[PDB]
Amino acid sequence: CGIWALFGSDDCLSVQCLSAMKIAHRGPDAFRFENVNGYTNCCFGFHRLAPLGMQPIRVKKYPYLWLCYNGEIYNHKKMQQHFEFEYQTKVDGEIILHLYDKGGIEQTICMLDGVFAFVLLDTANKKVFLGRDTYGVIPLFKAMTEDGFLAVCSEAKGLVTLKHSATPFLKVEPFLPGHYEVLDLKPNGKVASVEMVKYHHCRDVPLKLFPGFEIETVKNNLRILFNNAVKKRLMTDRRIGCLLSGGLDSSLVAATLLKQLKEAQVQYPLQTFAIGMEDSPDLLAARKVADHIGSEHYEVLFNSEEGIQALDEVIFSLETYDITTVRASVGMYLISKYIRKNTDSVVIFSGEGSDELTQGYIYFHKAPSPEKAEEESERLLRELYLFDVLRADRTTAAHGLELRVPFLDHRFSSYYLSLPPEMRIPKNGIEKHLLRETFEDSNLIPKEILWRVKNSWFKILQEYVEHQVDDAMMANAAQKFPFNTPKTKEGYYYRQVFERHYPGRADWLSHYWMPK
Amino acid sequence: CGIWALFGSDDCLSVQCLSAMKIAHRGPDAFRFENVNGYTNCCFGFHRLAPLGMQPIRVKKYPYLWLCYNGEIYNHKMQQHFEFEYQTKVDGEIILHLYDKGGIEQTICMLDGVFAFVLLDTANKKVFLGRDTYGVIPLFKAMTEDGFLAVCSEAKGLVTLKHSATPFLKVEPFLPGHYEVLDLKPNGKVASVEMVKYHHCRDVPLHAFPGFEIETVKNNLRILFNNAVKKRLMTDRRIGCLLSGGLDSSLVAATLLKQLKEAQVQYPLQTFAIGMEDSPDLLAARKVADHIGSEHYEVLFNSEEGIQALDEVIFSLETYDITTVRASVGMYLISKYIRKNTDSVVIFSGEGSDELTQGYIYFHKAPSPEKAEEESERLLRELYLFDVLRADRTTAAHGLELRVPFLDHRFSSYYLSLPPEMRIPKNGIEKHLLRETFEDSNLIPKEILWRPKNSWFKILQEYVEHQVDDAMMANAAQKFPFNTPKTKEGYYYRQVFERHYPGRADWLSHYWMPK
């Protein structure tokens, strides 16, 4: 789904509908453009994927509450029962209105375990509220003007097109994950920012066994939390698939997903997807996992020409120029296109965030101290809304598909980060040793995968960019891209394409990778 | 309230949204712009006039029915007769409750009120377009041979539309009294299937003295006029009136005030009269207001504003007819004054009396009463272009509403069913039956009931005399081949209309027939 708001508008709302429709790829099934009574300058916009729920949500009990949200709140039945809240509509996000009425904005955002990005408007109290998930899933982009012009969109493609007269420059920036912004609605449609507070994560009480921090009492808790995350991500009326990259995280996610699906009396078989080159070891591992679990495996053979042609599309969708995310997202875009075309699975489960939480990266072997490794992991999790969640989310949503990341749930990630740093660090030369040990006896995935001319894909990209980028431009790039100057030709070409699609807005990224 | 629906659109939808906002003046409170699931090419748009609804009506009992209408029916509270539960607070949902009951022919023939609706049935794969018998609520359709369809309220919301597959699209006013059925092809585009008239009264059997003697007809006419005013009274907005100083406006104002007093209405009636300084029409309006006690607001509009409002009047009225523009200048000014310095939205006016009651001066020179009846029926059929068109385009242009009490289905059917001798002028005075009907109720002073019948045309001609050169009137036969203006005023109106609406000048076939 795609949310969109235009609180404050000196221009007409018809010239500003093209920007709203620029994110129509998120849901190509419905679209509603609606204004707000008394504040006709401010409007809304929603896109839906897959009967008679739509947005904005205006309920009879709260006539002054206007909510435009996209994502999934998993603990809505566990809270509509704890506090009786009659829901007029079948929308998952209706509980946000009730929680806001009951206890304001601070308590309506800390009890939404799940992924979400919402815009809330209160005419009675004359206030506007924004929100994003604590890890950056379900992104949000905000554009603010000193006059009081406010814009919010799911992606940045819906804000750069927007025209605001009486102000030459409009600043479009990604909404900081884990934050809520309270702004005051002036009686002319404009807004004035009143506060911006980070609510961090939470460890919800209404969600078994959590004795302490012993080795045998940690693996059991990790298993319980992972299974609970998969179970709570299961809830949906749409088909669920999986992306088998061949790694430990994807294999564990697929195995647990299959087990919980079988426990949920689900009729459709699970569809696991793998993308790679011919006879690649990753594809072999994915096929081994699929055969071990018995899932409908769909292998996609990567051809370099398709990636070369789709470089521009993936740069446009991802809205970034970082080399690593583009290289890792070209294949994800292709596999999402294949899933949309040849299969009927929309909900996609991936093991994104495991490497940045379970110390899964190679350079973590060179951490001077476990505390440094923990700090690096926390920093990666904070900056996850720009590198991997962006790659796993924008590319997935570019084809009308939904993303689920069980490794990025609040409870399991919080418990893993609360573990002593001596346990998260690699122990016997293998990264993420604790996660591998926690599933030794469950027999979820084969043992050889549990504990585990060279990669001839980046060579094609390197040679293509080298042929397409001149050395004189690279020398000139110091005075051509003053902010985040590319150091290689690949970065230069990615930046060139990104500026061609988005001119002058390159502040969305400030670093690349690898703090060895 | 304005409605704007697209079917079979191929040139996206965001670039086609700016055409809908051209009718935002009808309702400036809210605005919706929806789509059709499975038919993304099709889209809907509603402009609401003022708490929680919009009119892409989808009722959970009929998930495949999407209705958009801009009007108000007076027979919905048929709900008691049919025991039809209504999910929403709108009075158009019953249309769906009727469409499943008996189709579209029976639904549109039992709607007592003004309406122009578009309905989409996905299950039956059809689109239905409807308009009232006298066309009080406007409706304009633009259809291409490819399958494109654009149904709006006014025409200003369709001339902006773009067809990337056809150079020219024909925007024509939907006929007043027809229902149109179109087959919904899978590609969103719609072909043309059927278009049948439904005419007039068929709802009076299933909802609420024979003879033609002079007393019985008078009693029946009084009863029907009172019933029309009473059924038009129902609304949540304030009710005003336009005191033109004539018989029809005075009668409507008196009956409206009497019913409002019978309705325990707290707010006083607001009667508005626009005219020149010290004019007989304004004096008559003041006399009527004093006799009935309504709060009277008088506007002494000067020639400068009327001249400066000619462009906007022609833009809103979408016509180049001389008389329509002449009356529409004053109607537009009085509507602007009403919106600006008054909280009254619903307006009552006698638009349809001079045609249905044969109250024009030239009706005296009638070759026969049958000829007069035929002329009156011809005027009623073309009423959606001259008088109703102005009374709607100059009212909805300021976020107001028009409630014509004289063009009631039962009242018109009974008046037109009378012998032609009674309708014709009796003693050299037109509308004799209407005047005799209310001669005992003491609604309005006798000096105004009788005595049948302000220099604004002269300044209009003076302004448009040094604006159309004598050379520009010589080539009018080669500059405006269709409906060539015979006067300089008509040439000015036509040039303004062409500047606002280029090429699409076939909406008005004739100009106006005084005989």
Numbering used by the authors:
A (entry chain A): 1 to 50, 54 to 55, 57 to 211, 220 to 464, 476 to 539
B (entry chain B): 1 to 50, 54 to 55, 57 to 81, 83 to 213, 222 to 466, 478 to 539
From the paper:
Here, we use human ASNS, a Class II glutamine-dependent amidotransferase that mediates asparagine biosynthesis, as a model system to evaluate whether EM-derived maps can provide insights into conformational changes that might mediate function in multi-site enzymes. As in all other glutamine-dependent enzymes, catalytic turnover requires that ammonia must move through an intramolecular tunnel connecting the active sites. Human ASNS is also of considerable biomedical interest, having been linked to metastatic progression in breast cancer, sarcoma cell proliferation, and decreased effectiveness of clinical treatments for acute lymphoblastic leukemia. Moreover, ASNS variants are strongly correlated with impaired neural development in children, pointing to the importance of gaining an in-depth understanding of how single residue changes might affect activity by altering the conformational preferences and dynamics of the enzyme.
Arg-142 is conserved in mammalian asparagine synthetases, Sequence and structural alignments, however, show that that cognate residue in Escherichia coli AS-B is isoleucine (Ile-143) even though nearby residues are conserved in both homologs. We were able to determine the structure of the R142I variant dimer at 3.35 Å resolution by cryo-EM in order to assess the validity of these MD simulations. As expected, replacing a polar group by a hydrophobic side chain had little impact on the overall structure of the enzyme (0.483 Å RMSD of WT vs. the R142I variant) although structural changes in the tunnel region are observed that will be the subject of future computational analysis. The N-terminal entrance to the tunnel linking the two active sites is open in the EM structure, similar to that seen in the X-ray structure of the C1A AS-B variant bound to glutamine and AMP. When L-aspartate was varied at saturating levels of L-glutamine, but in the absence of ammonia, the kinetics of PPi formation showed 4- and 2-fold reductions in turnover number for the R142I and R142A variants, respectively. In addition, given that the gate to the tunnel is open in the two variants, as seen in the MD simulations and in the cryo-EM structure of the unliganded R142I variant, ammonia trafficking is expected to be maintained at the WT level and so have little impact on steady-state kinetic properties. Replacing the positively charged Arg-142 side chain by the smaller, hydrophobic side chains of isoleucine or alanine, however, clearly alters how the C-terminal synthetase domain in human ASNS responds to different nitrogen sources. More importantly, these calculations raise the possibility of a role for Arg-142 in maintaining the structural integrity of the tunnel after formation of the β-aspartyl-AMP intermediate; this finding may underpin the observed kinetic properties of the R142I variant although additional experiments and simulations will be needed to support this hypothesis.
